[PDB]
């Protein structure tokens, strides 16, 4: 509806994506979580292994 579009459009007013949150005020803390949907094949010929993950950062 209208209120959704108004909230979305005005959200990035005067927002600089070049600067991290809390720049010069605090330390940006990021909470990480991983859900390994599948541990992919391990290659001995490369010292390489594949892993399919849902990577969540908050």
């Amino acid at each position: 509806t209208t209120v959704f579009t108004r909230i979305l459009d005005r959200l990035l007013d005067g927002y600089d994506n070049r600067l991290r949150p809390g720049l010069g005020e605090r330390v940006t803390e990021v909470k990480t979580d991983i859900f390994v949907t599948s541990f992919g094949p391990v290659s001995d010929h490369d010292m390489e292994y594949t892993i399919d993950v849902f990577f969540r950062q908050s």
Binding site: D16, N17, R18, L19, L23, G24, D46, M47, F55
Partner: protein, 202 residues
């Protein structure tokens, strides 16, 4: 801080190198080798993963403030002048883009710019396989500016030129990392004379 960035980008022509009419642009280069990958003797090539860092001075990016350093991700990397550095003996090279572009840009108040990025390079190495399996090699990794001759860009090695990690986590199946060295030369081409720099891994 956004005011500082907006002021810096105002009237800034990234097509022109710093000191375009005054003097050559001096660049200080550093390498951290995460891993010299396997040496593929069939195709006469070897893989190498590096953190490649370049430091130079841009008078246009001077700013007077109490912050004294702007630490930034890749967002502004395309907004300013960057050197034309490329690896001469690289059959195939790739940057890294997961999760975001693996690039870093730091700008000091005095105009010093540090630009770092992660690279994976499949560098050519013409192995002389005489004395195999007693053979030893010194594989190079060369780089220089693609367009700017020596009169416009000059590279320089720092004291801590090239650094290496443990070297036991490297992907060397056949060989053992013996040693390292760095060199600077001037290579004449049809375009001009270019300041080439090589890192030799033994």
């Amino acid at each position: 801080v956004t005011v500082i960035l907006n002021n810096l980008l105002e009237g800034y022509d990234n097509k022109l190198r710093p000191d375009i009419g005054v003097k050559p642009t001096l660049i200080h280069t550093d390498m951290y080798v995460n891993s010299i990958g396997p040496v593929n003797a069939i195709n006469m090539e070897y893989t190498i993963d590096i953190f490649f860092a370049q430091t130079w001075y841009d008078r246009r990016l001077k700013f007077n403030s109490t912050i004294k350093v702007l630490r930034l991700n890749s967002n502004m990397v395309g907004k300013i002048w960057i050197p034309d550095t490329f690896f001469r003996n690289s059959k195939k090279a790739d940057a890294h883009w997961i999760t975001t572009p693996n690039r870093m840009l730091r700008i000091w108040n005095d105009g010093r710019v540090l630009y770092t990025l992660r690279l994976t390079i499949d560098a050519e190495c013409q192995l002389q396989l005489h004395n195999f399996p007693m053979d030893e090699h010194s594989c190079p990794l060369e780089f220089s500016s693609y367009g700017y001759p020596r009169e416009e860009i000059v590279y320089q090695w720092k004291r801590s030129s090239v650094e290496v990690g443990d070297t036991r986590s490297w992907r060397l199946y056949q060989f053992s990392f013996v040693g390292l060295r760095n060199t600077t030369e001037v290579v004449k081409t049809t375009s001009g004379d270019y300041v080439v720099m090589s890192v030799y891994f033994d």
